[PDB]
From Swiss-Prot:
It comes from Lederbergia lenta (Bacillus lentus). This is Subtilisin Savinase. Ca(2+) 1 binds at Q2, D40, L73, N75, I77, V79. Secretion of subtilisin is associated with onset of sporulation, and many mutations which block sporulation at early stages affect expression levels of subtilisin. However, subtilisin is not necessary for normal sporulation. InterPro entries: Peptidase_S8/S53_dom, Peptidase_S8/S53_dom_sf, Peptidase_S8_Asp-AS, Peptidase_S8_His-AS, Peptidase_S8_Ser-AS, Peptidase_S8_subtilisin-like, Peptidase_S8_subtilisin-rel, Subtilisin_Carlsberg-like. Belongs to the peptidase S8 family.
Length: 269
């Protein structure tokens, strides 16, 4: 039996699926710890930029979990993605420990741009600015990729990098009451928020797990961007970004919530 995780329902993705929008034909790169083969996922390709981890399989679990929130398959098992027909690419920029380098992350972004990805999901952060990261984000953006990044889980009033760079869309996390999750970083640069508490998704070993974090929120937004691109094939990264903010459900102060809660229904109206 297939279950619909609460956050998928909260961003109203099934309404968009009922309009026939499922992310078909949209290329989405997951820059993370990899993505493992899973009965509820379809991986179309990928690349690794971790020294000594030449495969794209996931030795951590984080990347597989993030991938399922974007595109777990619509079928008789498991869970369901915001964009269950999106084309998933596994771009390994983090090692099994969950950490990587600004150089691997930047290589991943360059790969996404060079390979015509439409959306790049970065459920990761670096605590400090890096000109290398910034130029990579800028480069991918100028080639046409929409970069979506997590605000981070320290609870502080400033957001992590590369989410804090202007050309990266910054996503924070809400809970089931549509309040900001205590850990979700906020402040200058925050664009939008999405469910990030008790998020069930796909996990290595053909299983499912629940996790918390802005890493879990971010793929809700990447998924929604995929639905908007299927409806509006000519739209640029910038148009998609602005339309998501414009159609989000306001939750209050932009400092804490950016435009508010991503709404897949209102954005594909
Ligand atoms: Ca499924
Ligand atoms: Ca930003």
């Amino acid at each position: 039996a297939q279950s619909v995780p609460w956050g998928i329902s909260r961003v109203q993705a099934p309404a968009a699926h009922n309009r026939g929008l499922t992310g078909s034909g949209v290329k989405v790169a997951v820059l993370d710890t990899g993505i493992s083969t899973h009965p509820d996922l379809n991986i179309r390709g990928g690349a690794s930029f971790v020294p000594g981890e030449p495969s794209t399989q996931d030795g951590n679990g984080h990347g597989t979990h993030v991938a399922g929130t974007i595109a777990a398959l619509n079928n008789s098992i498991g869970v369901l993605g915001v964009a269950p027909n999106a084309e998933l690419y596994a771009v390994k920029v983090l090692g099994a420990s969950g950490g990587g380098s600004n150089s691997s992350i930047a290589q991943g972004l360059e790969w996404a741009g060079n390979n015509g990805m439409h959306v790049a999901n970065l459920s990761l952060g670096s605590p400090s600015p890096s000109a290398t990261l910034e130029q990579a984000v800028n480069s991918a953006t100028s080639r046409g990729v929409l970069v979506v990044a997590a605000s981070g889980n320290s609870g502080a009033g400033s957001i992590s990098y590369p989410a804090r760079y202007a050309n990266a869309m910054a996503v924070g996390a809400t809970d089931q009451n549509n309040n900001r999750a205590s850990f979700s970083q906020y402040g200058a640069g925050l664009d939008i928020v999405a469910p990030g508490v008790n998020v069930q998704s796909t996990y290595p070993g053909s299983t499912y797990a629940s996790l918390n974090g802005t890493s879990m929120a971010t793929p809700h937004v990447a998924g929604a961007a995929a639905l908007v691109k299927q409806k509006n094939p000519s739209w640029s990264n910038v148009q998609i970004r602005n339309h998501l903010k414009n159609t989000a459900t306001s939750l209050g102060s932009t400092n804490l919530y950016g435009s508010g809660l991503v709404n897949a229904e209102a954005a594909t109206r």
